[PDB]
Amino acid sequence: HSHGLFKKLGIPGPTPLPFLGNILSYHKGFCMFDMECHKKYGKVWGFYDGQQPVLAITDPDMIKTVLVKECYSVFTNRRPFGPVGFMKSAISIAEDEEWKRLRSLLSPTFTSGKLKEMVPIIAQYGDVLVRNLRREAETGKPVTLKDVFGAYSMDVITSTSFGVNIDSLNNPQDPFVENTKKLPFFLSITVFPFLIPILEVLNICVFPREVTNFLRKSVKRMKESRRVDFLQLMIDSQNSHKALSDLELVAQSIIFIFAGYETTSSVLSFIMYELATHPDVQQKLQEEIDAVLPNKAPPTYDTVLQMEYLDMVVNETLRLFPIAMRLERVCKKDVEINGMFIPKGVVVMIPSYALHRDPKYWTEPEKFLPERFSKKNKDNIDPYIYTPFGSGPRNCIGMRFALMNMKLALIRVLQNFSFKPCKETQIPLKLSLGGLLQPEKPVVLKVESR
Amino acid sequence: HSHGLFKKLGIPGPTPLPFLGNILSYHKGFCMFDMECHKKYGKVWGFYDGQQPVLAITDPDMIKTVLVKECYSVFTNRRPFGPVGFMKSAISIAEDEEWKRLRSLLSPTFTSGKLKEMVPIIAQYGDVLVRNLRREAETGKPVTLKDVFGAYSMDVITSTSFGVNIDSLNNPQDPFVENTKKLPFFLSITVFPFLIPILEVLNICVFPREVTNFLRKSVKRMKESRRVDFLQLMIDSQNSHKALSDLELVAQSIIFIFAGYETTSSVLSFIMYELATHPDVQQKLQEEIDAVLPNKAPPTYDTVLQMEYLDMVVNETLRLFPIAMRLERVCKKDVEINGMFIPKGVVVMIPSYALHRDPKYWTEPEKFLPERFSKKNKDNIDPYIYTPFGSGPRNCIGMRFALMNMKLALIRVLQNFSFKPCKETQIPLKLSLGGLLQPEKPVVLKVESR
Ligand code: HEM
Ligand code: HEM
Numbered sequence A, B: 001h002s003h004g005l006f007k008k009l010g011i012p013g014p015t016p017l018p019f020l021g022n023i024l025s026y027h028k029g030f031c032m033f034d035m036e037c038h039k040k041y042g043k044v045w046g047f048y049d050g051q052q053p054v055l056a057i058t059d060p061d062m063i064k065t066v067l068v069k070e071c072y073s074v075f076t077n078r079r080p081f082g083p084v085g086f087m088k089s090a091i092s093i094a095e096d097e098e099w100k101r102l103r104s105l106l107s108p109t110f111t112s113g114k115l116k117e118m119v120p121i122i123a124q125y126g127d128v129l130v131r132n133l134r135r136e137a138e139t140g141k142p143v144t145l146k147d148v149f150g151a152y153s154m155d156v157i158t159s160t161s162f163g164v165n166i167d168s169l170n171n172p173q174d175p176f177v178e179n180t181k182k183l184p185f186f187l188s189i190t191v192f193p194f195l196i197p198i199l200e201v202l203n204i205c206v207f208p209r210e211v212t213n214f215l216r217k218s219v220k221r222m223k224e225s226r227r228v229d230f231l232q233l234m235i236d237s238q239n240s241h242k243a244l245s246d247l248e249l250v251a252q253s254i255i256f257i258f259a260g261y262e263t264t265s266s267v268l269s270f271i272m273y274e275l276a277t278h279p280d281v282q283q284k285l286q287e288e289i290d291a292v293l294p295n296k297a298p299p300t301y302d303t304v305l306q307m308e309y310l311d312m313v314v315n316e317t318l319r320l321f322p323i324a325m326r327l328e329r330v331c332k333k334d335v336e337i338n339g340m341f342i343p344k345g346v347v348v349m350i351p352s353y354a355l356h357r358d359p360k361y362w363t364e365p366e367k368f369l370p371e372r373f374s375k376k377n378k379d380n381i382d383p384y385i386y387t388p389f390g391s392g393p394r395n396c397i398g399m400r401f402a403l404m405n406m407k408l409a410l411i412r413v414l415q416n417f418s419f420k421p422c423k424e425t426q427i428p429l430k431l432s433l434g435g436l437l438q439p440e441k442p443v444v445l446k447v448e449s450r
């Protein structure tokens, strides 16, 4: 019963168990599962998330066909998941013409011109991050990066998307911060996908109605009271053609809070762990920042893009830690791409974590070597093997904003502080075996003032 | 032979002559021909440009279906014309997926953010226009508007699209101005459409190879030597997906020189004729400009959009003089829209001039009444009866730039000069019976200094 698909197609893979499929192999998580399957089976393999067949591909030509060439026609939507409730209008969750409509209505929001207008706002809380770090640096005590970076990442969101100016580390009782931090169920949905329609008619949603109703009623207070923020850029858009609905506008805001707060703060903790365990990379980066920005000059939009070694450090960290881990597209038609037939309903998956650490494409893939992305070596990197933001029409729409936000934080922090490991700094860093790419133990480092 | 199409469909219209069709009725031009056909036949009618059937529509619901609803699927391209040569890659001439590709690659070029960056450049030559007008104002002599406005409109193009700073009125020998002013055949093509492929294989083009080869070799001098100009915004775009080709990039530049130089200068001459023949409209506009910009303050992007009466004067002039005169779409499939069958190959036409002067939609349509577009009355205007920039996915892509350019010129001119008619001022203004909406005799007015 649906477990003989890859058997008939002649595709290798682990033998699935009834009902469960291959989900028991997730005990070490999927990044360790994708690496093992990439070795035992080769270029392609197939497993089952319960009854859902998943076809993994690693050929760069075939990846380009799925992500770019046959996107609008075949591989348009991602794996369906629920219950979402009213959040079906989210751009990352929307499907077919509904997504292509929202992707068009939100594309001008992420241009370089709008991002350059957001830099003064993002740089404002970079100084707040330094002041909070200095209070932890002048008092000798190891700092938890996920708490000090999460406070910064939240500060950027509340202003760049709603204009609410809060010091999350010093103002927790503000209704916005208290609700945006709210903010076993999912492995059950993986094995019980026939219970998603039950939770939808029961009005259960993966987001608590506490936060959504607050954000829905907080946005209408901001909309009816009213710039440079994502909210105003979406209000001006509603003034495919059919304009952004009121409910759709709030659904996109919540998606921007999830990614911006948790991706930006988690990658910064990964970067600072690599910079602390490699003092040579941190010193060379601090020398480039001081050369471009002397006398601790404030970073601007142009000065950030001028730093090449900073971009090399960010790109190398995203290679070791691609937080998305996997890229997925649902096959909607019986299509044959690159001489391989893919039936309808099969979930095509790209193991980004496994491809980023593949020794056949990277020399010493486990080492932190920023020289891979130097201007002399960046050309020999396949853009479909290294996909930290995906690829194609449905790649990360906030790639430029996320890169600009993290670099503005790293510049202002490395201008004032040098980071060194502690005795309790878990070296080497072990990744969590859950559903999010995060360190097992939180990263703790010693912050010293320059 | 192809002259019995509207006869079979039951569509009224003038009886066509063999070979010629109804082109002999163009002796008074098409705007007088569209008005007469709108009266004798009613809401729809059909005539023949030689052997080419042309179906005219005036119903606002059916116009929306052609221009917006059934654009990408049916009414996508305009009437084919030649010989164009390498200019087939022009966005206004491109067809089907080629146009939709160029429309996407050039859409971010015309955003409000890029236009706001062009205002300091456009406002620079507004002062040049005042200095040249003052030299003609201090010496009492009637000024020809088409020569003083054409000098300004050319000055805006050479800078906003290539960065070349020239005073066209004072520097005619510059290779750019001398070539951009270079810059019976077409009625023959209308009756002889089977000679277009002959001129294409003979390498004859509607543009002289003198200018095109110069512009093609002048752009490559500018490209290989290198901001804020249309050229750089297109160079950054090439750095549908498949990037702007080198030849395609030059073809779009020539199209921008045609529209920007000749539309902007011709509408300004129409506006100043209406302001001179209506001193009350000119005084009220000069009072609004002085109220927003006291002490002859320079106009900015925000201060231009703040002037409502200035927008009312511009919109009313474009009603009396829609320079495009007609909107045309080629019917590519046998489609039935709004209960009317339209065969394949028929040219659907929207008589913008006739609709703008239709007494059934406008009270006293021949009078210059800017109060029609007031904020209290602008709501009762159908956006598919008043189409000075077209409508739908293939409307005027430079609408915002053209409106901002003309208003910046009117503000800086009306800040320093008051315009009064002369004895040789042809009142009332008679339109030319040619192919371009221009006054028969050039508009001459008296310029006095404030
Ligand atoms: C280090 C930071 C980030 C990384 C590495 C990252 C990575 C990714 C990846 C891999 C995808 C899927 C691409 C694909 O399926 O081909 C994605 C999608 C997306 N990302 Fe990000 N992201 C980051 C931060 C952000 C931020 C700050 C935003 C702010 C709005 C954002 C908004 C989105 C959206 C809306 C989508 C879905 C787009 C669509 O489905 O059309 N991401 N991101
Ligand atoms: C008073 C000034 C102008 C007026 C009234 C005007 C009007 C129009 C109209 C009526 C159309 C056809 C719309 C349709 O077929 O539905 C058009 C097309 C177009 N206009 Fe303008 N125009 C003006 C100036 C400009 C300027 C300054 C540019 C600068 C680039 C420009 C670029 C274009 C282009 C590229 C197209 C064709 C777009 C396409 O085919 O996709 N126009 N214009």
Ligand SMILES: CC(C)(C)OC(=O)N[C@@H](CS[C@@H](Cc1ccccc1)C(=O)NCCCc1cccnc1)Cc1ccccc1
Residues within 6 Å of the ligand: A081, A090, A092, A093, A186, A187, A255, A258, A259, A263, A324, A396, A435, A436
């Ligand atoms: C672990 C498990 C697979 C059981 O579960 C999920 O991880 N489930 C997701 C569902 S679909 C998601 C789209 C998306 C998927 C994968 C990677 C990026 C994006 C979505 O809709 N938004 C995500 C927010 C935007 C973002 C995040 C990270 C990087 N770039 C952008 C995740 C999800 C769903 C709903 C709300 C938040 C997160």
Ligand SMILES: CC(C)(C)OC(=O)N[C@@H](CS[C@@H](Cc1ccccc1)C(=O)NCCCc1cccnc1)Cc1ccccc1
Residues within 6 Å of the ligand: B081, B090, B092, B093, B186, B187, B255, B258, B259, B263, B324, B396, B435, B436
């Ligand atoms: C009088 C007659 C019909 C025999 O002839 C033409 O009038 N022929 C045109 C051909 S198609 C044109 C697209 C277009 C058509 C009509 C109105 C606007 C645009 C084109 O391609 N570009 C035009 C330049 C952009 C522009 C102009 C005016 C207003 N807004 C934008 C005109 C033409 C062709 C080639 C080069 C220049 C002009």
